[PDB]
Amino acid sequence: TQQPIVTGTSVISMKYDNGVIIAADNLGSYGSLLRFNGVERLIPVGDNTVVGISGDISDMQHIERLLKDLVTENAYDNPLADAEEALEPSYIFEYLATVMYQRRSKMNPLWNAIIVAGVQSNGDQFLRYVNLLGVTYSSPTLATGFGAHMANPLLRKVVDRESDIPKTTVQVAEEAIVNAMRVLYYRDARSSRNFSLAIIDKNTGLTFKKNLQVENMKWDFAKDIKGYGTQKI
Amino acid sequence: TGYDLSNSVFSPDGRNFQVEYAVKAVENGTTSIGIKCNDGVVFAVEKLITSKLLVPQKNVKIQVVDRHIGCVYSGLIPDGRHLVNRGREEAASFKKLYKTPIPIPAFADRLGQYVQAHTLYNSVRPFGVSTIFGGVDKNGAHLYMLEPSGSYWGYKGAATGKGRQSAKAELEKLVDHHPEGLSAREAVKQAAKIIYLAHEDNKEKDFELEISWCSLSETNGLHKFVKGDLLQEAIDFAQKEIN
């Protein structure tokens, strides 16, 4: 048993016709203090998987090292390490899910919520969640923390069920993700303007975008808001 | 007499005969070599084709440690694998604690101390392999060769197994004729030639060539196997030199 100290907020994601998108802001909060402004919380594993992590950053850095070590170990005595015996999203997820549930069962959890996004060998989209309790689930959209409450409603308007996935292009899906990140910046007190976004496509591969900013913000109506009821000026 | 029946017993000479007997297992094995080049190292090995039923390119002998170290050995193949497994644990604990990947001299001593420990007790057997290994670290390229006693040194070129004398002669010519140094691509070609020349000692059965390399320019300081066109180019160069 511990308490989280340095923390990361929402990770958001969705499936589209040919792949998956995942995103997370670049902040490490220390309670209410917005302490660290250059923290990468999307961690790629090979050219087919991105693991997005929220919660305790010290535990995130531990998980990052586990994944880095997993790639090293998979390469050992493996002539097909960059081909048929490369690490899959499903393998990386199940490993993390095993570790998470083992750690909760020893009453010493890794204080995180994790989304593994990727594309499998056969071109199938992979998107699955796991947290500090070892709870797992999959859905056409997935989000952690505040993102569950605010991003999912927006992303579900694009992909409400499985049959909507082939109808959704990469442009429409990315647009929905970028808008969701703006909404979180308006409304989450432990978020930042700067974020990272990753697209894993079955055709075009892994595209990792750094140093993105929330833009096209509406604050102009603020000038017209005065007082809390009766004040006229 | 009886001094050679038990490991870790000194003979009246001051020798450990069980270690010297392990060297005979090494001398019985196939030929393997190492060549230090300008910005890296090249490893090569002779694989005897016992039968047509062996699948080509499948029974891989050279092994990677971490992502930057290559290991090859001659002698009892399982003993070599056991040593590499330990090497991988040593490299992992070094990287876990200190962050940086294990330096090659540091890694050499980790294997050296472990092999040496298997000459300290009668309850264990010495290693029946000599292991040629190395790679690229922060201080540049390093090649090492490690014996059943735990003895190791740094090398410009290294060779062990049944064809070692033939190989050692060829390596000595390269050191004399290239004092300014040898390139990585040159070292691959020369490694192929040396294994082909060293095959005259195991000339009954035909063989399969296997090469690997770490080079700062050619592989970004990572261990990779030589495959496809670059392997065939090295085989053709080797076939031309014997004829």
Side-chain angles (χ1 to χ4, degrees):
Chain A
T1 299
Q2 357 80 292
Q3 46 173 342
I5 306 298
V6 183
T7 57
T9 189
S10 317
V11 175
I12 65 164
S13 61
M14 66 184 290
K15 294 176 175 182
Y16 66 96
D17 56 19
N18 302 151
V20 294
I21 304 175
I22 185 160
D25 67 29
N26 303 327
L27 181 63
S29 300
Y30 185 82
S32 63
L33 171 56
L34 309 178
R35 180 71 194 84
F36 303 115
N37 288 124
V39 181
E40 185 56 66
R41 304 196 292 110
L42 302 176
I43 42 171
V45 188
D47 57 11
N48 67 178
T49 311
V50 181
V51 181
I53 304 177
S54 64
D56 187 280
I57 298 296
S58 79
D59 290 337
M60 184 187 80
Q61 288 176 357
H62 175 86
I63 291 159
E64 192 172 343
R65 193 180 64 183
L66 291 180
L67 292 168
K68 182 179 156 64
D69 193 61
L70 219 194
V71 173
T72 309
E73 216 81 40
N74 188 69
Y76 290 159
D77 308 328
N78 188 15
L80 311 173
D82 65 329
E84 296 100 323
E85 288 303 332
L87 288 168
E88 288 280 76
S90 61
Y91 309 167
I92 291 157
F93 176 84
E94 207 71 42
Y95 172 66
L96 293 171
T98 306
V99 171
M100 296 308 270
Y101 185 73
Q102 278 178 189
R103 290 289 297 270
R104 94 93 216 195
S105 302
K106 299 191 319 202
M107 298 295 284
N108 180 215
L110 289 163
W111 208 285
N112 300 102
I114 302 166
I115 293 167
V116 176
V119 178
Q120 299 280 111
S121 296
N122 65 350
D124 285 9
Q125 298 97 318
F126 189 90
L127 197 69
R128 205 168 167 83
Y129 166 107
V130 65
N131 66 21
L132 77 171
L133 299 173
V135 174
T136 63
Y137 45 78
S138 186
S139 182
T141 70
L142 285 174
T144 73
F146 268 94
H149 300 101
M150 300 204 73
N152 272 329
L154 298 170
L155 304 176
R156 286 164 187 176
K157 287 161 73 80
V158 185
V159 288
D160 208 30
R161 67 257 315 289
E162 199 74 12
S163 63
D164 293 337
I165 292 163
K167 300 171 190 179
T168 313
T169 63
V170 72
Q171 280 183 7
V172 171
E174 184 174 11
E175 185 177 321
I177 291 287
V178 171
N179 173 250
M181 294 299 294
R182 174 164 56 247
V183 171
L184 294 164
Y185 187 60
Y186 288 146
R187 244 64 211 199
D188 185 355
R190 308 177 79 188
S191 63
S192 90
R193 191 164 179 174
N194 300 107
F195 70 101
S196 301
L197 187 143
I199 304 165
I200 310 96
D201 196 278
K202 72 182 181 178
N203 300 317
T204 61
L206 203 161
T207 310
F208 199 98
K209 301 188 181 187
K210 289 177 180 284
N211 301 125
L212 271 41
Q213 277 217 138
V214 171
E215 277 157 28
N216 304 320
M217 289 199 294
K218 301 188 174 57
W219 293 95
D220 195 67
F221 64 91
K223 69 181 194 298
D224 305 312
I225 282 147
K226 310 178 174 177
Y228 46 84
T230 62
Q231 199 172 294
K232 309 197 205 212
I233 60 178
Chain B
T1 47
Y3 297 100
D4 72 334
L5 300 167
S6 188
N7 188 22
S8 85
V9 176
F10 288 108
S11 67
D13 304 303
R15 290 153 65 191
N16 187 357
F17 272 93
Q18 275 292 132
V19 172
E20 291 178 20
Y21 296 173
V23 171
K24 299 288 178 181
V26 177
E27 293 173 5
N28 196 245
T30 67
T31 312
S32 70
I33 58 164
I35 307 174
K36 190 187 182 176
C37 69
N38 283 328
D39 66 339
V41 289
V42 178
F43 308 97
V45 65
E46 174 189 52
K47 293 163 55 169
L48 297 175
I49 303 165
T50 322
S51 174
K52 273 273 177 178
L53 298 161
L54 282 164
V55 185
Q57 269 72 62
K58 279 288 185 291
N59 296 291
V60 182
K61 277 194 169 187
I62 297 165
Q63 288 185 281
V64 71
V65 175
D66 205 300
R67 283 133 98 155
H68 68 303
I69 298 162
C71 294
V72 70
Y73 41 78
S74 298
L76 302 182
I77 300 303
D79 285 22
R81 278 191 54 77
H82 179 99
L83 185 57
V84 170
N85 286 166
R86 176 71 181 202
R88 289 162 171 174
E89 292 173 13
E90 296 278 16
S93 93
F94 189 97
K95 178 133 68 79
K96 188 178 192 289
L97 184 56
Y98 303 127
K99 198 72 165 66
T100 186
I102 190 159
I104 316 307
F107 177 71
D109 204 57
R110 294 298 182 83
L111 297 185
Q113 299 287 351
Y114 188 68
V115 172
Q116 193 271 171
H118 290 74
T119 71
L120 290 176
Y121 318 94
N122 62 198
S123 54
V124 290
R125 174 174 62 72
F127 282 90
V129 283
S130 278
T131 315
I132 296 165
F133 64 95
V136 178
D137 68 14
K138 170 250 282 178
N139 293 125
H142 294 90
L143 178 71
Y144 282 90
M145 186 175 142
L146 168 62
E147 294 188 56
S149 61
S151 178
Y152 70 82
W153 304 111
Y155 286 85
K156 293 166 181 175
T160 184
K162 194 138 66 182
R164 88 207 84 100
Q165 285 196 338
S166 180
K168 276 201 184 81
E170 253 55 47
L171 275 320
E172 278 178 27
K173 292 170 188 178
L174 291 169
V175 172
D176 294 330
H177 296 135
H178 303 272
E180 30 55 50
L182 201 68
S183 80
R185 288 175 161 275
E186 276 281 85
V188 170
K189 289 179 175 181
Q190 294 299 144
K193 188 180 76 73
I194 293 161
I195 291 291
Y196 266 83
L197 266 60
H199 188 61
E200 265 53 34
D201 305 5
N202 267 112
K203 78 208 309 185
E204 297 98 328
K205 295 283 166 67
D206 45 33
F207 77 106
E208 188 183 303
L209 180 60
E210 185 178 290
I211 310 166
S212 84
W213 65 341
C214 313
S215 174
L216 190 62
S217 59
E218 299 288 336
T219 65
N220 252 56
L222 301 175
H223 183 264
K224 293 187 195 295
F225 287 84
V226 178
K227 290 145 58 69
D229 292 3
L230 189 65
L231 180 59
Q232 190 61 56
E233 182 184 302
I235 289 163
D236 292 344
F237 179 87
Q239 277 272 212
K240 196 188 81 209
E241 294 285 304
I242 63 159
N243 301 338

